[PDB]
């Protein structure tokens, strides 16, 4: 059934893009200002933040890029937004930003410094996909998230109590968490975990080990490719008309869209762009914790691991100057595309079968199974 | 170590998932 799914969130991509357009025509920016990754972002989060402000916008004078520290009437935002979703709410919409900027952190950093606060191994990485990722996101929004991440939550929600309605909260989060798990023991011994209603260290120790089990037999865990705004707007803006031509999150819509994408980022002195276009790269698909071989394998070119990549981060802070700051253009472009799974695979070869395929193969028609015999650099971006 | 240990897979393909 390709006419609510492939369509219904086509026309909320629509939205995006629209207000994407009508905030571009506010702050009344260029087109090259237009695709600045950089200002697309700062408006994503000032509409989020109003729906649940001001933030900084670059500009672009003879020479050099000027940076304004701008504020909109929180209102004024929600006013736009709906104006763009026919007065609607879409929270998808703003749930799928919500992503977009989830997925971009999960590549840019590493958050061990609240793993191991929270009591769990800081090499448990894999399994923190969308630990940043509000609560606010939606049901959809948090099937995307990792087994570790739940359990992130749980241990602080419960550690701070055994240290009303919280309840229903607390034997759903389990729920959704063993929906994650995918064998007999995995599913059961969750349950055993949801009986206490004071779970005390008997949970707090039972589930990090739930944790580690997942580390080998994975789970299912969504992965939503969740472009930047501006990607949407321009598209939008280009004639494309996604409620009709209908549009995915897990096809080869994103990839495609991905293929004409004109995006441009601000870039530190010292920098490789190369390095930059990459991060971004991974952020549009939750590759992050991906098999780096693989990841460069759809890629087209090297994906060079966390530490050997030159860059700090894509936003930038107050603290820099824009003297000494140029800007590039993104390399987004992949070789081939691949169905962004769920499944964590099982039985050591998984997915048996599932293969790769080419940009011009709009259908699933046919796959390519990929030889890793190779001179390769790496399986852990961390 | 302060690394990672295993690969999440975010594509549907034939590979050898890494731990």
């Given at each position: 059934?390709?006419?609510?799914?492939?369509?219904?969130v086509?026309?909320?991509?629509?939205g995006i893009?629209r207000?994407?357009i009508?905030?571009?025509?506010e702050?009344?920016?260029?087109?090259?200002?237009?695709?600045?990754?950089?200002?697309?972002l700062?408006?994503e989060?000032?509409?989020?933040?109003?729906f649940?402000?001001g933030?900084?916008?670059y500009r672009?004078?003879?020479?050099?890029?000027?940076?304004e520290?701008?504020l909109?009437?929180?209102?004024?935002?929600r006013?736009?937004?709906r104006?763009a979703?026919?007065?609607?709410?879409?929270?998808?919409?703003?749930?799928?930003?919500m992503?977009?900027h989830?997925?971009?952190?999960?590549?840019?950093?590493?958050?061990?410094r609240?793993?191991?606060?929270?009591?769990?191994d800081?090499?448990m990485?894999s399994?923190?996909?969308?630990?940043?990722?509000?609560?606010?996101s939606?049901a959809?929004?948090?099937?995307?998230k990792?087994?570790?991440?739940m359990?992130?939550?749980?241990?602080?929600m419960?550690?701070?109590?055994i240290?009303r309605?919280?309840r229903?909260?607390?034997?759903?989060?389990?729920?959704?968490?063993?929906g994650?798990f995918?064998?007999?023991?995995?599913r059961?011994?969750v349950?055993q975990?949801?009986?206490?209603?004071?779970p005390?260290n008997?949970?707090?120790?039972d589930?990090?080990?739930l944790?580690r089990?997942?580390?080998?037999l994975?789970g299912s865990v969504?992965?939503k490719?969740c472009?930047?705004?501006?990607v949407?707007?321009?598209?939008?803006?280009?004639?494309?008309?996604?409620?009709?031509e209908?549009?995915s999150?897990?096809?080869?819509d994103?990839?495609?869209?991905?293929?004409?994408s004109?995006?441009?980022?601000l870039?530190?002195?010292?920098?490789n762009?190369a390095?930059?276009s990459?991060?971004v790269?991974m952020?549009?698909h939750?590759?992050?914790?991906?098999?780096l071989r693989?990841?460069?394998?759809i890629?087209?070119?090297?994906?060079?691991?966390?530490?050997?990549?030159?860059?700090?981060?894509?936003?930038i802070?107050?603290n820099?100057?824009m003297?000494?700051?140029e800007s590039?253009?993104?390399?987004?472009?992949?070789?081939?595309?691949?169905?962004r799974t769920?499944?964590?695979?099982?039985?050591?070869?998984?997915?048996?079968?599932?293969?790769?395929f080419?940009?011009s193969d709009?259908?699933?028609?046919?796959?390519?199974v990929?030889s890793?015999?190779?001179?390769?650099?790496?399986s852990?971006?961390? | 170590?302060?690394?990672?240990?295993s690969i999440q897979?975010?594509?549907?393909?034939?590979?050898?998932?890494?731990?």
């Open positions: 059934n390709a006419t609510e799914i492939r369509a219904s086509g026309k909320m991509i629509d893009g207000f994407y009508q905030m571009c025509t702050l009344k920016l260029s087109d090259y200002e237009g695709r600045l990754i950089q200002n697309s700062t408006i989060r000032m509409v989020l933040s109003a649940d402000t933030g900084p916008i672009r004078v003879d020479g050099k890029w000027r940076r520290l701008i909109y009437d929180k209102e004024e935002i006013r736009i937004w104006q979703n026919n007065g609607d709410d879409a929270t998808a919409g703003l749930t799928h930003m992503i977009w989830s997925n971009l952190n999960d590549a840019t950093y590493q958050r061990t609240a793993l191991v606060r929270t009591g769990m800081p090499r990485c399994l923190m996909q969308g630990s940043t990722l509000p609560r606010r939606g959809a929004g948090a099937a995307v990792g087994v570790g991440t359990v992130m939550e749980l241990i602080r419960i550690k701070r109590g240290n309605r919280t229903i909260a607390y034997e759903r989060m389990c729920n959704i968490l063993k994650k995918q064998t007999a023991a995995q059961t011994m349950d975990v949801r009986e206490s209603r004071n005390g008997a949970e707090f120790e589930l990090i080990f944790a089990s997942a580390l080998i994975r969504a992965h490719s472009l930047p705004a501006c949407y707007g321009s598209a939008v803006a280009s004639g494309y008309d996604f409620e009709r209908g549009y999150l897990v096809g080869i994103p990839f495609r869209l991905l293929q004409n004109q995006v441009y980022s870039i530190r002195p010292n920098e762009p390095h930059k990459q991060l790269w952020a549009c939750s590759a992050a914790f991906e098999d693989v990841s460069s394998f890629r087209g070119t090297k994906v060079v691991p966390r530490g050997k990549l030159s860059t700090r981060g894509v936003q802070a107050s820099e100057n003297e000494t700051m590039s253009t993104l390399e987004l472009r992949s070789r081939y595309w691949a169905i769920r499944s964590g695979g099982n039985t050591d070869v998984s997915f048996q079968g599932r293969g790769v080419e940009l709009e259908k699933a028609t046919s796959p390519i990929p890793f015999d190779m001179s390769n650099e790496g852990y971006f961390f | 170590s302060s690394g990672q240990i897979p975010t594509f549907s393909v034939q590979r050898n998932l890494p731990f």
